[PDB]
C-alpha positions as a LaTeX table, in Angstrom:
\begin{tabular}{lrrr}
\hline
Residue & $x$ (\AA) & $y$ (\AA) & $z$ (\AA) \\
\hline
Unk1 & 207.24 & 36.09 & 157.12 \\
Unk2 & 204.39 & 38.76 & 156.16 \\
Unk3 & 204.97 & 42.33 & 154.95 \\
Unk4 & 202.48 & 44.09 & 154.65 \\
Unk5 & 201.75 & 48.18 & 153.56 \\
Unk6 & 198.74 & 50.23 & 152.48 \\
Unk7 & 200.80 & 51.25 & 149.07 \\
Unk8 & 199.65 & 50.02 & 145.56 \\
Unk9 & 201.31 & 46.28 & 144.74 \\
Unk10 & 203.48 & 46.12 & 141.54 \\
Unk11 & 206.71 & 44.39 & 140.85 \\
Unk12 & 210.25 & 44.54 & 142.02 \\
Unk13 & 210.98 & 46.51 & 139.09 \\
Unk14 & 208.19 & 48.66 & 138.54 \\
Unk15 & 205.87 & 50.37 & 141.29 \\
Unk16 & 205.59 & 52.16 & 144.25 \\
Unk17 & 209.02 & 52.16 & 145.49 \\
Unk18 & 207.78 & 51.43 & 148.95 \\
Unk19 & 206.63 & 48.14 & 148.10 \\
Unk20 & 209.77 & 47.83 & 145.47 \\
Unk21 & 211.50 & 47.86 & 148.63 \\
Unk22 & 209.86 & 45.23 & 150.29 \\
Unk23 & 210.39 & 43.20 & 147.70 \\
Unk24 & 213.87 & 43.74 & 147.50 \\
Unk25 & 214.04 & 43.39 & 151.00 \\
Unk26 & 212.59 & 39.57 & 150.90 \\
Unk27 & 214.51 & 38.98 & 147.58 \\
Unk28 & 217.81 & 39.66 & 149.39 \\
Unk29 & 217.32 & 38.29 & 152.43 \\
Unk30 & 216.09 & 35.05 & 150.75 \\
Unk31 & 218.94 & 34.81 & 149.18 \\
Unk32 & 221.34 & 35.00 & 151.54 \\
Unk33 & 219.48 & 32.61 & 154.42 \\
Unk34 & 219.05 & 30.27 & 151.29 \\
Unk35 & 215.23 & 29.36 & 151.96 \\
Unk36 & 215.49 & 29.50 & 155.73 \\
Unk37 & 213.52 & 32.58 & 155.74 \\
Unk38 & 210.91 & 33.34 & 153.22 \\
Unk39 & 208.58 & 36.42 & 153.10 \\
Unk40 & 204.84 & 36.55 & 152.02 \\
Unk41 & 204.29 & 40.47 & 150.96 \\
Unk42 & 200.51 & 42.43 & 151.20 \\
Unk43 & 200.15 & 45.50 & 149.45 \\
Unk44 & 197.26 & 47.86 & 149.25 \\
Unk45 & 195.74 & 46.76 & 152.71 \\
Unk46 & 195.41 & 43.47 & 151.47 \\
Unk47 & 196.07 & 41.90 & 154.45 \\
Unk48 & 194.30 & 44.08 & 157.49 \\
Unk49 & 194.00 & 47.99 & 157.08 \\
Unk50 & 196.39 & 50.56 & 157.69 \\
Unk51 & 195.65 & 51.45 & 160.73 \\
Unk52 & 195.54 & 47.73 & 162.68 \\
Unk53 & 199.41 & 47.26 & 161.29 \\
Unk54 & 201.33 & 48.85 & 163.89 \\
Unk55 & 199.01 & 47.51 & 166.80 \\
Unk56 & 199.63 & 44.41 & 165.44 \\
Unk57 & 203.27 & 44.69 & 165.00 \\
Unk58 & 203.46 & 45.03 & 168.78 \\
Unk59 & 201.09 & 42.23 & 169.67 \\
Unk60 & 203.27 & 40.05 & 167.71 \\
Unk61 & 200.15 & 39.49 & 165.77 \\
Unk62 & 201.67 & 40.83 & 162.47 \\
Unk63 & 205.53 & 40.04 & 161.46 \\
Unk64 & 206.73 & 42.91 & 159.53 \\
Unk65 & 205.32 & 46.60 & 157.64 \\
Unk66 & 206.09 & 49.68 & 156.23 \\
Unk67 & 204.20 & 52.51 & 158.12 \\
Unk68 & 204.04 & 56.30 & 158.17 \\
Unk69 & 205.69 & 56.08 & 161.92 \\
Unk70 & 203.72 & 58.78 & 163.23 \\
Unk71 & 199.67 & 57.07 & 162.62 \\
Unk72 & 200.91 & 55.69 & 165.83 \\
Unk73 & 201.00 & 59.22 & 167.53 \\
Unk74 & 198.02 & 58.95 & 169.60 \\
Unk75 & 199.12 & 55.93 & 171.62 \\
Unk76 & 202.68 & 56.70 & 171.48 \\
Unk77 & 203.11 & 60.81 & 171.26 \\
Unk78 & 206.69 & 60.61 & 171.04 \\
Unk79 & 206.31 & 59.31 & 167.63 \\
Unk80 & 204.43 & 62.01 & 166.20 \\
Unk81 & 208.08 & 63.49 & 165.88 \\
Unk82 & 207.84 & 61.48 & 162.48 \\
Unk83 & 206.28 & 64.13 & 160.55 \\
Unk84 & 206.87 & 67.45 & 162.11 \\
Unk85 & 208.06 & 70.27 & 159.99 \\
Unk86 & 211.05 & 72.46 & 160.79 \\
Unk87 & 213.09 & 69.08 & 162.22 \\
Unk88 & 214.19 & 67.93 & 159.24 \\
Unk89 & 215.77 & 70.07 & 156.45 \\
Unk90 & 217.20 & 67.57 & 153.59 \\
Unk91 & 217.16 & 64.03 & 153.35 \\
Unk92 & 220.85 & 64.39 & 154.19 \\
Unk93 & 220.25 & 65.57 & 157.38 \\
Unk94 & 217.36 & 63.51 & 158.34 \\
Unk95 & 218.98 & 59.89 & 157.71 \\
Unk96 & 221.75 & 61.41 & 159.66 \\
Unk97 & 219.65 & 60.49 & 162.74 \\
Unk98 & 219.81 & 57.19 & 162.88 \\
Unk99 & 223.15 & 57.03 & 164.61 \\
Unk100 & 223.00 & 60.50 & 166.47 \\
Unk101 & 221.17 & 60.73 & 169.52 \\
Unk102 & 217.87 & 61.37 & 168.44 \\
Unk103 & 217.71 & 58.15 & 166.00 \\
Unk104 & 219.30 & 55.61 & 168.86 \\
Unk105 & 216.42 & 57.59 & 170.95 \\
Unk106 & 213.63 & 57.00 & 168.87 \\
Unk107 & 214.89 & 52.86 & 168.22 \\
Unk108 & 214.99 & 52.71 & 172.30 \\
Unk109 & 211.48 & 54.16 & 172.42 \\
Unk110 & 210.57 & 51.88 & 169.58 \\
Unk111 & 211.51 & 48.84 & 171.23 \\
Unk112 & 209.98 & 49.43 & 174.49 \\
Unk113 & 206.98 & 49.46 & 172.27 \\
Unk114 & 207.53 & 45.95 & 170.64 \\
Unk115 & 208.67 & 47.56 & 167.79 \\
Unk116 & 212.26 & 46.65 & 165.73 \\
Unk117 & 213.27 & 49.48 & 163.03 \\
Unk118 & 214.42 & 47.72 & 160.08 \\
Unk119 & 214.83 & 49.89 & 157.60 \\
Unk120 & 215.09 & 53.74 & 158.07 \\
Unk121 & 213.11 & 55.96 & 155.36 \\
Unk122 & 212.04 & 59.57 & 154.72 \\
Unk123 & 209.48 & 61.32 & 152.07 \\
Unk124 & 209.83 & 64.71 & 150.86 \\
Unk125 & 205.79 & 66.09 & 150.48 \\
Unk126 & 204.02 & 68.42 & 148.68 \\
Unk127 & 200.32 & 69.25 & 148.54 \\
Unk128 & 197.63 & 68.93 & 146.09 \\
Unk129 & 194.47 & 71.00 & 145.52 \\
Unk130 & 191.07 & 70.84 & 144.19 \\
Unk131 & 191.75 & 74.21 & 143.19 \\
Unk132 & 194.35 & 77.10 & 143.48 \\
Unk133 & 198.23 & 76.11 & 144.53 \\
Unk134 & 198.40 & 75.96 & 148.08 \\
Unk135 & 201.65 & 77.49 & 147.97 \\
Unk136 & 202.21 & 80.04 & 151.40 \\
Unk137 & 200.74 & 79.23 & 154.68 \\
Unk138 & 198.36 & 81.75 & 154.06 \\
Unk139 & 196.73 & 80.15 & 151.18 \\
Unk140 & 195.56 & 77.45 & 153.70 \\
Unk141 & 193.28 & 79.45 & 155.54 \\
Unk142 & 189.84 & 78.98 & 154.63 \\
Unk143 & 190.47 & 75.85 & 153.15 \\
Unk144 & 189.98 & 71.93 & 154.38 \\
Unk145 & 193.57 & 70.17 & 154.43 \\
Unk146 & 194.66 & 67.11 & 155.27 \\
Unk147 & 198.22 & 67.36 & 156.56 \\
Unk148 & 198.88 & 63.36 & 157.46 \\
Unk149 & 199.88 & 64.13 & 160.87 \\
Unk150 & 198.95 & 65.54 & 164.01 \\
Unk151 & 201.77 & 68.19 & 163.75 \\
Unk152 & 201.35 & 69.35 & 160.50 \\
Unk153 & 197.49 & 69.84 & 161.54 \\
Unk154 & 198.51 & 72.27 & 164.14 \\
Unk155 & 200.40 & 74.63 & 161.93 \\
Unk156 & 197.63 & 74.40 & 158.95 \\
Unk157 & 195.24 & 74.82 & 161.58 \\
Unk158 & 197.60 & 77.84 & 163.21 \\
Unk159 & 197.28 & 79.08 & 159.46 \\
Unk160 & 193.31 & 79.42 & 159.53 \\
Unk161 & 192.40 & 75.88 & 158.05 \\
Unk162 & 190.39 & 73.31 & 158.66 \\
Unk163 & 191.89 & 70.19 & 159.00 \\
Unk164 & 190.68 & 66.62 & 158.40 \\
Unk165 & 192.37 & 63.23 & 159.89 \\
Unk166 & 192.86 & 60.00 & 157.11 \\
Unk167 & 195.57 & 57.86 & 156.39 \\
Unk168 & 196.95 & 58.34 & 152.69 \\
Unk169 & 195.24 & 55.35 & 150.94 \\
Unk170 & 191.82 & 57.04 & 151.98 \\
Unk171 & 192.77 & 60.57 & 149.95 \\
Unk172 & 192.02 & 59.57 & 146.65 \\
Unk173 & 188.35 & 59.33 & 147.68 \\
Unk174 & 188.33 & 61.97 & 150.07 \\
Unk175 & 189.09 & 64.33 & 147.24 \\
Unk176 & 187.18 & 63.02 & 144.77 \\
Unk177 & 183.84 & 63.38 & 146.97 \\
Unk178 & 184.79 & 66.69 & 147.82 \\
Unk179 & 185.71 & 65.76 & 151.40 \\
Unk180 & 188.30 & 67.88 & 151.46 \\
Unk181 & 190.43 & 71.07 & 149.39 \\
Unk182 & 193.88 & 69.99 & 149.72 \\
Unk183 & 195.61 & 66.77 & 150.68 \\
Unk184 & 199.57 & 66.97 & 151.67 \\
Unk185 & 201.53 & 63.26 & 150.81 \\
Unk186 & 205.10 & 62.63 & 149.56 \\
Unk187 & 205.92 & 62.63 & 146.35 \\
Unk188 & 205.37 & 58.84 & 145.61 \\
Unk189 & 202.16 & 58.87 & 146.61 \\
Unk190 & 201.03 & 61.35 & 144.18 \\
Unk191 & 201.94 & 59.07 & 141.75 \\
Unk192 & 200.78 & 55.75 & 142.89 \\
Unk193 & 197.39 & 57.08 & 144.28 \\
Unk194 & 196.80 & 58.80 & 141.10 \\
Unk195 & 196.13 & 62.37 & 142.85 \\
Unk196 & 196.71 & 63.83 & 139.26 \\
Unk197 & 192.65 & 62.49 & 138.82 \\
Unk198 & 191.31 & 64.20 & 141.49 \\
Unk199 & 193.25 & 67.78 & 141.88 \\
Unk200 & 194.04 & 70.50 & 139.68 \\
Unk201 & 196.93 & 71.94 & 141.22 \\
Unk202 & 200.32 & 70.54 & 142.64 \\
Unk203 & 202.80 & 72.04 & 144.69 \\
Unk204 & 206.44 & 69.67 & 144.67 \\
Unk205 & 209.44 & 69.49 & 146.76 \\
Unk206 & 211.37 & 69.93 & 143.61 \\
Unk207 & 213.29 & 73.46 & 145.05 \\
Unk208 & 212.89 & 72.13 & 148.71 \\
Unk209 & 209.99 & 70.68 & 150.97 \\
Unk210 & 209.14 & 71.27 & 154.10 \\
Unk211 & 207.02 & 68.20 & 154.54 \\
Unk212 & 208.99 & 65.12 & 154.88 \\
Unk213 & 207.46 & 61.99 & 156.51 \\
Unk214 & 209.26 & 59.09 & 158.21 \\
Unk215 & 207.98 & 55.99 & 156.42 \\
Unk216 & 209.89 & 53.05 & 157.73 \\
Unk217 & 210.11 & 49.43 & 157.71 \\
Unk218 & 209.43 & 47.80 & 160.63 \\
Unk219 & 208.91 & 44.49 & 162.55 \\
Unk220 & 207.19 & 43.21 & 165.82 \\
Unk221 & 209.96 & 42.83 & 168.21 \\
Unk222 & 208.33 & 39.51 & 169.42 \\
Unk223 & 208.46 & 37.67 & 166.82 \\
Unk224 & 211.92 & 39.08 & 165.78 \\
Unk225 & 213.68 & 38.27 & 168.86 \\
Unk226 & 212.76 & 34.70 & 169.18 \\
Unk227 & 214.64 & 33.78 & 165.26 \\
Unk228 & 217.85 & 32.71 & 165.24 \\
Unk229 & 221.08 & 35.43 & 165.45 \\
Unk230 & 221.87 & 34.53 & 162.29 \\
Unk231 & 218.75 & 35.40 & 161.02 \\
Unk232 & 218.41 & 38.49 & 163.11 \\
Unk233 & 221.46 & 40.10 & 161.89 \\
Unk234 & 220.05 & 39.08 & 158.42 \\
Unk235 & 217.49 & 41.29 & 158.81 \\
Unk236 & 219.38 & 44.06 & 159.93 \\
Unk237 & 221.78 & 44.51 & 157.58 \\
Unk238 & 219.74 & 43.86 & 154.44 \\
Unk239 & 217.49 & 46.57 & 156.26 \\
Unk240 & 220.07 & 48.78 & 156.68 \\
Unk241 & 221.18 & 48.87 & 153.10 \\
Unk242 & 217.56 & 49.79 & 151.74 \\
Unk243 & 218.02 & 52.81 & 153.12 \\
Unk244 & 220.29 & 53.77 & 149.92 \\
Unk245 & 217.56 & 52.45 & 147.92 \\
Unk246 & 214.87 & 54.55 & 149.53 \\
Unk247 & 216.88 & 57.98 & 149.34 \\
Unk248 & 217.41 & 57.72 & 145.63 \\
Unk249 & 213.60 & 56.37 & 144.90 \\
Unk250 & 212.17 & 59.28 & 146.83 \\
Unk251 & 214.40 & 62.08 & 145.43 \\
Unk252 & 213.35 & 60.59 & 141.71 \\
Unk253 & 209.44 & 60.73 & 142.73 \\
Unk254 & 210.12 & 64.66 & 143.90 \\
Unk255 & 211.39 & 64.88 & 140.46 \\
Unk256 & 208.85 & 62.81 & 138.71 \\
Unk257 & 205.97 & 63.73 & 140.16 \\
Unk258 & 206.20 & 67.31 & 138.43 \\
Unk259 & 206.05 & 66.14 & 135.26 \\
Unk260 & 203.28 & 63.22 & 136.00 \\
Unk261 & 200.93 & 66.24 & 136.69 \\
Unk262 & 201.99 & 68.66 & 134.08 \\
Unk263 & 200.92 & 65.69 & 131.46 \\
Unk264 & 197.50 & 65.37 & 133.58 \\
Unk265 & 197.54 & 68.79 & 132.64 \\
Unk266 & 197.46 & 70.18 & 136.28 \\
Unk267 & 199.28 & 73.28 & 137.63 \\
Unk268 & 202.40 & 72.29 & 138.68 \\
Unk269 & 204.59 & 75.12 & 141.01 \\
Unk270 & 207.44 & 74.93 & 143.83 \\
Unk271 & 208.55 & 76.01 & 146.82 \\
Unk272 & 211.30 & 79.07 & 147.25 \\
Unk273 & 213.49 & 79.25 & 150.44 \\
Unk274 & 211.48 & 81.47 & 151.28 \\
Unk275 & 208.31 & 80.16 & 151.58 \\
Unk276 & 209.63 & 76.95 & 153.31 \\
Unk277 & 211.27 & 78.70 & 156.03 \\
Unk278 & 207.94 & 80.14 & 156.51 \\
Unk279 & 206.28 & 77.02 & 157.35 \\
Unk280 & 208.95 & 75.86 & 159.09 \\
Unk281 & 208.49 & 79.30 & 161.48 \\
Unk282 & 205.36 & 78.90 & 161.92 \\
Unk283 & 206.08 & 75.23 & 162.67 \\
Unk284 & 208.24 & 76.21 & 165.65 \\
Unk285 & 205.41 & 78.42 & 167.11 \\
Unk286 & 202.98 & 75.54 & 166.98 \\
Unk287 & 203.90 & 72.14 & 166.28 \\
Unk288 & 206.94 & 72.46 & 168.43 \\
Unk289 & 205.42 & 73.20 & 171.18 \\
Unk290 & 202.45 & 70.94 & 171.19 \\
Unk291 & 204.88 & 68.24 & 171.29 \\
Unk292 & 207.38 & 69.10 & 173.45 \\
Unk293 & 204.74 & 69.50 & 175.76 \\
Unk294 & 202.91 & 66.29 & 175.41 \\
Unk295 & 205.09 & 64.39 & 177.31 \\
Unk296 & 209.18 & 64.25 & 178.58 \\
Unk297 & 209.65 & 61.70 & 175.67 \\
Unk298 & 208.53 & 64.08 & 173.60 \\
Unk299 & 210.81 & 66.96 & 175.13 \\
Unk300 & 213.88 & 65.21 & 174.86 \\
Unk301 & 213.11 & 63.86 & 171.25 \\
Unk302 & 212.51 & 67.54 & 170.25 \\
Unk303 & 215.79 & 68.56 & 172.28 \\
Unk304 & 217.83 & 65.78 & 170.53 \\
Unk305 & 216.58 & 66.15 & 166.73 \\
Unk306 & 217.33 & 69.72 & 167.36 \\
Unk307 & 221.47 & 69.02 & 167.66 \\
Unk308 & 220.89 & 67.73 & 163.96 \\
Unk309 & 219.63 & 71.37 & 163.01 \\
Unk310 & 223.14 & 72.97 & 164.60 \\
Unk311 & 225.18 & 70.18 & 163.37 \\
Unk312 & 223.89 & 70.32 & 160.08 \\
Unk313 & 224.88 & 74.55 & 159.95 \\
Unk314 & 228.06 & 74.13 & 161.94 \\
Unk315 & 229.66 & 70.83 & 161.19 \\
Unk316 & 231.18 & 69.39 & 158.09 \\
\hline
\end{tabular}
């Protein structure tokens, strides 16, 4: 079976925790079916480029990858839900989706798409700059960002930027040839892309984010549903249990990350309650409303991943 991502190859100990997971994902699975399945993994684009993954997925063309969900946004708006600030709050509170109503929402959607959701996983952001900190969404405008989704577009663009489309392995140059100002990624991606060589200026989700991406493994629901049960549930519950693996990864990188740049010699600042909640305002005004309006998939996502914002204030 072939994984493939658009993140820099390493090992199973050492890399890009993305494709750490993979790895550990094969490893494991291997183990337990004892040979019966056996996984081929492509990192860096190595096997088709980011963007032809998810198509592919669907088409049964491509077994398994690990994709920002929400590339897929223009065929599928519902999905754009994937990065969309203001939804998600903590990683506590995100991962609580997958068994609330939003989560078994998005896997229905999913599936009606071709697509199987192995492995649930979410990325705390930041953003990186050519120049000053963008720190407020004020300090946007006038400036050429990439956000890395639709939805975060229309709240930079709200803010007075202009904003440019890429997927993240295309940043690194995009920067360097002056392309654009500021790129927003998570935290692991400023490391493995090696952002620190092409920015002076980092702003981490050290004290908070309010850029957090859904990232998750995935497989074409074709070729999925014709292996064995066995094999199937294989799948699924190794999948399930790198989501433990990808919560602690990602909080290190938010850590991490801060002190990969300070050594670089960047500036290296956070983000105060404040200034996230600001965002996240703004977000509501925007991004909010461009999707709930998109579609009735996209309204009753928005209505449902909502309940997580209440339940995460008024529950325990």
């Amino acid at each position: 079976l072939k994984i493939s991502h658009q993140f820099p190859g390493g090992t199973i100990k050492e890399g890009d925790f993305r494709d750490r997971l993979v790895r550990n994902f094969a490893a494991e699975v291997e183990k337990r079916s004892k040979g019966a399945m056996k996984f081929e993994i492509y990192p860096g684009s190595s096997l088709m480029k980011t963007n032809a993954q998810f198509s592919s997925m669907r088409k049964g063309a491509l077994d398994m990858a690990l994709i920002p969900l929400s590339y897929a946004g223009g065929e599928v708006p519902e999905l754009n839900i994937g990065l969309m600030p203001g939804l998600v709050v903590s990683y506590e509170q995100a991962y609580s989706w997958k068994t609330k109503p939003v989560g078994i929402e998005l896997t229905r959607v999913l599936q009606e798409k071709g697509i199987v959701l192995i492995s649930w996983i979410w990325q705390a952001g930041g953003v990186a700059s050519r120049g000053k900190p963008v720190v407020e969404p004020e300090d946007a405008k006038g400036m050429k960002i990439r956000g890395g989704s639709r939805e975060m577009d229309m709240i930079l663009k709200d803010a007075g930027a202009a904003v440019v489309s890429l997927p993240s392995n295309e940043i690194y140059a995009a920067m360097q040839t002056g392309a654009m100002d500021a790129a927003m990624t998570s935290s692991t991606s400023f490391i493995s892309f090696r952002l620190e060589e092409v920015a002076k200026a980092l702003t981490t989700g050290r004290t908070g984010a309010y850029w957090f991406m859904f990232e998750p493994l995935m497989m074409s629901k074709a070729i999925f549903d014709k292996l064995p049960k066995d094999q199937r549930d294989m799948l699924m519950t190794v999948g399930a249990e790198m989501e433990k693996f990808a919560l602690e990864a990602a909080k290190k990188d938010d850590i991490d990350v801060a002190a990969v740049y300070q050594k670089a010699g960047a500036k290296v600042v956070d983000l105060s309650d404040g200034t996230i909640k600001k965002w996240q305002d703004i977000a509501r005004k925007t991004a909010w409303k461009d999707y709930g309006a998109k579609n009735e998939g996209c309204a009753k996502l928005l209505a449902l991943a909502q309940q997580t914002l209440a339940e995460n204030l008024y529950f325990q």
